[PDB]
Amino acid sequence: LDPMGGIVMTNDGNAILREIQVQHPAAKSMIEISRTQDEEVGDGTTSV
Amino acid sequence: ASLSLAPVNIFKAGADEERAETARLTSFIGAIAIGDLVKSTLGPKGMDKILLSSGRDASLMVTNDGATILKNIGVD
Amino acid sequence: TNDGATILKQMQVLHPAARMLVELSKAQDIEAGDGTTSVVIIAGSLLDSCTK
Amino acid sequence: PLSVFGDRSTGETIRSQNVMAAASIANIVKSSLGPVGLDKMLVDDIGDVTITNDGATILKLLEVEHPAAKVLCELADLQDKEVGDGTTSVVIIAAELLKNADELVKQKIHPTSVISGYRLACKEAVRYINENLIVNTDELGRDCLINAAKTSMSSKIIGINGDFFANMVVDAVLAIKYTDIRGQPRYPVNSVNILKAHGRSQMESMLISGYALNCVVGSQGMPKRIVNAKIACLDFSLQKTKMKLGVQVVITDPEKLDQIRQRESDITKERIQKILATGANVILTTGGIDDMCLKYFVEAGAMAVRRVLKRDLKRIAKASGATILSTLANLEGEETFEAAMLGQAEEVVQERICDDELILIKNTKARTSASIILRGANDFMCDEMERSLHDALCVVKRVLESKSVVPGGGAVEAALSIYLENYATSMGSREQLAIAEFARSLLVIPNTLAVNAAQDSTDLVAKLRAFHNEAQVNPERKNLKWIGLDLSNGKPRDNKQAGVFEPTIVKVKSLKFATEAAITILRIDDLIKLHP
Amino acid sequence: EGISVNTGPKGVINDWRRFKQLETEQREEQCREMERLIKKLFLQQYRKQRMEEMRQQLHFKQVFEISGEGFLDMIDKEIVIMVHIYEDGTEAMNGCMICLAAEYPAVKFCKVKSSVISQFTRNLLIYKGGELIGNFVRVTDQFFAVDLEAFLQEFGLLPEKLVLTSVRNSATCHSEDSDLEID
Amino acid sequence: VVSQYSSLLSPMSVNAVMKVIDPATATSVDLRDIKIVKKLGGTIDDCELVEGLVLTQKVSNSGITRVEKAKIGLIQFCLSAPKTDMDNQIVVSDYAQMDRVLREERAYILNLVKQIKKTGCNVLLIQKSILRDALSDLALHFLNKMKIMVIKDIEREDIEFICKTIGTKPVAHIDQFTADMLGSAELAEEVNLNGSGKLLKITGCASPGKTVTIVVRGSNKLVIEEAERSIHDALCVIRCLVKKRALIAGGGAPEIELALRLTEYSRTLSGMESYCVRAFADAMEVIPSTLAENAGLNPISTVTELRNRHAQGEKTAGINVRKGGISNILEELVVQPLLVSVSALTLATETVRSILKIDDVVNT
Amino acid sequence: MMPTPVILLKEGTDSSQGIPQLVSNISACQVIAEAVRTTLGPRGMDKLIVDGRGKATISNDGATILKLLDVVHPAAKTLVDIAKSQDAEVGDGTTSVTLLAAEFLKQVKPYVEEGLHPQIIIRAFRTATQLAVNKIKEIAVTVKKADKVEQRKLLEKCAMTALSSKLISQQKAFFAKMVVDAVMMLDDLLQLKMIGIKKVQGGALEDSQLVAGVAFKKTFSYAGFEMQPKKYHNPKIALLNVELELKAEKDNAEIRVHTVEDYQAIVDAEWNILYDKLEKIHHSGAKVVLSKLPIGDVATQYFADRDMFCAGRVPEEDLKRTMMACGGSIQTSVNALSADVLGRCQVFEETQIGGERYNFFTGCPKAKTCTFILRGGAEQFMEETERSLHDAIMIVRRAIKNDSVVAGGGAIEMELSKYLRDYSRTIPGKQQLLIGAYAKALEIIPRQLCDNAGFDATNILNKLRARHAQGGTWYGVDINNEDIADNFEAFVWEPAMVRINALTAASEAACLIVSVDETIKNPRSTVD
Ligand SMILES: Nc1ncnc2c1ncn2[C@@H]1O[C@H](COP(=O)(O)OP(=O)(O)O)[C@@H](O)[C@H]1O
């Protein structure tokens, strides 16, 4: 459930990690890792 | 160096002090006020004063006596 | 800083005699350039003797 | 009786407060020293994350309120500016110097004597370093550069991959070499464009034998690769011509409006016609290009790039031999463009880098230039790679400019401590104590190096001091000057043979700056803080 | 009565200024709050707004949540600054600010509760150059990101509109020491 | 604080004063002829005494630096499109005029640059302008093509100093820009301060002016400001030597001699004024106590020893911090001009007399 | 960290651990020592502390200053505790203990900061302290002569040394002689409660006196008291614990009579009971009557008619002291008032001292007590005089226990430092640095003396070090002569147990502080 009111319904790793707000800097690093994996090759986002 | 006019404060809160000229001024002002209050009640043609008490009793008195006038007033 | 004039001017002193001493240091700086600490110390000592 | 609207701390109170502030600043960064050092994570108020080991970066990002702490932070910044390495060692040395100097002052030693002793000790330390501990790099060949780079990149995110990053750095620095007047070589680091992009591992970081632009071609129509490139560098926008503020168009005969409007764009059309007719293939301009002119560039089969950075354009023009043209005006009052103003590179391509593209101007002639593309796991890792890489580039520049290096791992500090504690017996009576405390303060670096590795700091530093003392006393044991600390095994080691070097300028500038900062803080004995 | 007091207040100028600075801060806060606190107390169906919405999701961070001192000194220093007052239709406003902030890096979207700043609490402040240029109160009467975008562009408060690079290029700005070539 | 860097700064200050005045027929020193330039970075050991002038402005003409046998020209007009003093507009009603406007503006700029170059000028200083553009891009390009190092944004207040140093005469209209108005210099070079900044230095001038420049370097800003203040104090002291050329010992010797002699003088008076003069002498005795203090010396015993030595006849006996005792200080080379002690005494006495004539404070 | 929805400890629990908390503890101990540094030596200065009620406390004693400081730091409370411990066990050295403990901690701080294991430091401290105590016991000077005059001189010199740091140091010889006289009259247990200390405002310090007997303030005389004679030349003193006034015989007693004759008989019976008690007192031959319980007006007048003296409501301690000074027995019953239970003194007098009336019992050859009547200008003046006399009294008692002395003024500290450095020079080297740090820390006392006196501490320390190294055991700081001198020949003497206990307590405090690695502070309960 987005802050904008929309609903993202998926099992893709990158989307799930992208629509989540975190405060711990290590969690931010992990989110950035998910985005990097998605952008570089597009697959294996959950595995990484 | 006066007791009140010194860089270090030597008194409790609210404790005042008045040096020579100020003390003389206050004493003379008080004495003159009292004398002007009681006078005009002097001599065969003196007039009376009305004393309205501020207390709950609100007692009313009219008098020509200096002692009675001075006794029933708030003096500071 | 160690400059007497700079020290005196930098800090607000709020008292008339203190301000006159500050401007004394300024004047000594203008005419001489150094000795700004000595002149203020001398004025203070002179007034200290004036007390007694 | 002062009647000053503000606080006032005097004497031992303010002296101890200043020492407290400096020691706190030191203890902030003391844990990021040496190969067994560890990075720090800085999180701003809005939530940005910065993972770094550089002391200058940490001290710059941190909010600081005490003036002495500000002095040490600015000292680290200055050390970063003038040298580029040792930004943590300088802060640690300065804070230890203040601590020991204040301890001396508390013993009723006058601060002036302490300051004089510090000055004498600093001068003697610099002289002894320059006369005894320096190693000439002439006979060491290329291995000295690689080893200096590897030493500088230890304690960094790219520390383990030093075997590869050091070759990369040395090649990049040697690429930008140039000799100026009066016949000495100068190495203009910061002319190496460092481009970051997450993606593949660190080992896929590329050294471009050319220049790398972080931009894209203007239009999709123009080709993304040109083999024989004739670069034309321009410093003016290519748009419809708009007359200046002092000129206004007033029409009284309506028949002239069409001609006016036609010329309004025909002027730029003719300029581009000249530029393309000279034979140009690649056009880079700092100004913008509107779609009308992009159409000419597409039809001509040439690449046009807009909004190029000024420094990037200057570097491209210098490397390729082109000349920046802010206008098309010759010395006879005409619009023209000679072919001699065209730079040349043997290939200009637009490569895709992790779902993004950038122009790679490869192998420019008339000059060799270098650029570095860093690949990391995420943005934070790439930023730390860039910072450490800049540290290494600065170190290699210092080594190549001044050809003297000194052993690393606290060998210099221990040798200086021994020599200074020996030499202090001859100067004065209280500056004796000052110089002895300077020598003791110099020993904080090996202590911190050892304690960061969870080794026996006391025993290790005692062994190192014994080695250096025996080297200084015994005439024929001068080969023990290079004994430093091996933190991987926790034993003293010949650092000259181990390949642990650093430029002499780092140590010398660090000592001078630390001594001056300590003197500046120590000169204070009263603080007035006016109420805002 | 005619005291013409001599060096009387002089002996207490330190305390007088001690309270003077505090009352100056209090009056600064009061002036900042009160200046707006009570002073105010087919093309027709927007065919293109759906396209603007679907372009808006294509990019994330969050708006800055501010006490009173923070609100004062954020606008006192340093562009258009938008301040949203909320207490807990604020969710829709927050979403609109979140969506608009990314596409307009120049603007300084931020929000702050009214608790840290009783008629105002029960029932959007826009700054520019330290002075209020926006003139909107109770935006509930007159929603998505396109609604706020059109509402602000009607009065011309949103600066006019960027490509996405790899990650970044710049490291520092200082003396050039760029490429040089000498004989 | 720069007491450690004294062997470098004392001769620097003396030379700075002696290079801006005539040794004879000089009764004052204008300290505004000694410009102090502060540049962060380095240490105080890097302070310099540049003979020419140092400009913080950067060279607009990138790529050309360090011109030798420079012929500096300083202009006060603007190198841009023509613009009259009163409001002017150009009306275009035909495309021919539309092209001719650009053509003629280019021709005008080219003629300006050609006239400037014809005089042999190779360094150009341009005064700062706020109304119209002082240096257009076309003008800069033309000047670069002619190999002229262009320097813009020169402040208005610095014109007098620049003209006094280099020898350039300002030019306000191109009709008057001739070779005679050019200040020939040996070298005009732009240098970098080891990554801490860029300084523009014009060293070596035919017929140099009576100005010098002191460049102060330091590791932090605060020590730089204090070094500037200390250098200013040294220059002011040398100026105090220039006017009222009289030298006396320092180290508290004049103060203790004043105390002793004034006590003796007060013995010869009578009444309350004798008491006042004796108190004046006792107050003068303070400075030797302060000098004895702050040095680890016993103040009262040191002052008594000084007074005894002066009564013995040693006018130059003073406090010796190096030896931690009392000795002749002229052997320690501790001297100060007479117009420091005299000025301090006179000003302090004036202020005391002024304060003593005050009996009330009124708040407005 | 992570939120951990259900946390381990209570919310708000504060925990600090590692080297930083140890360094913080050392710094806190430094602060506590600095709070009392300037009170050490003959040049020491007093400290004034105002409580929350506005009452001031001008003091020089280190233990008193530390107690008046509301120290809440867990590590810093150890210094206050060891100061109080030294005050209780010995009575002097309450500043030296804190200075030594803080100096030990400061000296080991550099070694702590580099990761040295605290157990090593603790072992080094224990070894150095036991060696130093053995050395003190070895080199302490004792006189095995059983000479009473020599012992008295030793006690007077020790008391003078103990006193020459307080505001009564100007009259230190007079006060020390008086204190030595006071203590020598205690019999075998030297109980402090047997030495009364009375403070009377007004009068110079030299007007203070020691009473060879007992003296106490007049206690609420009733009507008819002024008719009693106020001087007796061989009185017999009746020490009683008896209420002499008309009152109910018992609280639960009730009288039930049904005849007016019985009513009159009961009234006369109460009167006869009181008069029988008074007559039994009078026929005992006593002339002075002191009672713990109130003595009524009827008894006062009865005694006045018989030329007797009465004083009721005498405090219990004063009655016990009168017992021990005169040689009687406190009687709760007057039925058997023999001559065995009656006190005796040469002279009793009721004189005036500075606006107060005092009863004096002098001329008691068999007295085992005394009384100090201190005169001063202010309440805090007499309080601090009492504190100084307490320090001197404890020193004299401890010296009575054993006449083993060492020279003061840092002489013993310098000798111990030299010995410990010499020992540390002959050990492998990890312990050598720590024992050398201990020895260097032992030099704080002469350094603090010089700093307080305004000396140049470094030169005095160098001279002392050279003198001790080249031979000379009792060389310490000479305050008046700006220099060093043989303190033993200068009669700067202290009992050895003072330094022994100081070293022991300082070492224990330092070891306890170093041994702690973590501090945990639970959230407060019932703050209200
Ligand atoms: N039919 C299957 N049987 C067994 N393993 C499978 C099958 N399909 C996929 N997998 C494995 O399961 C994993 C699925 O990962 P996936 O959900 O695609 O992660 P991501 O979305 O991050 O790529 C892959 O590693 C793949 O090897």
Ligand SMILES: Nc1ncnc2c1ncn2[C@@H]1O[C@H](COP(=O)(O)OP(=O)(O)O)[C@@H](O)[C@H]1O
């Ligand atoms: N391989 C190594 N072995 C031993 N010591 C090293 C090694 N590499 C670096 N050092 C030492 O570690 C110290 C700390 O370096 P570092 O803190 O990373 O540089 P900076 O001070 O610029 O941050 C340097 O003084 C260096 O001598």
Ligand SMILES: Nc1ncnc2c1ncn2[C@@H]1O[C@H](COP(=O)(O)OP(=O)(O)O)[C@@H](O)[C@H]1O
């Ligand atoms: N006449 C004296 N000269 C020098 N030092 C003295 C003299 N008398 C006492 N001292 C020193 O003063 C110290 C005691 O100071 P004080 O504050 O009185 O008690 P404490 O032992 O509690 O500090 C002792 O160490 C002693 O050596």
Ligand SMILES: [Mg+2]
């Ligand atoms: Mg998948």
Ligand SMILES: [Mg+2]
């Ligand atoms: Mg001076």
Ligand SMILES: [Mg+2]
């Ligand atoms: Mg480094």
Ligand SMILES: [Mg+2]
């Ligand atoms: Mg004592």
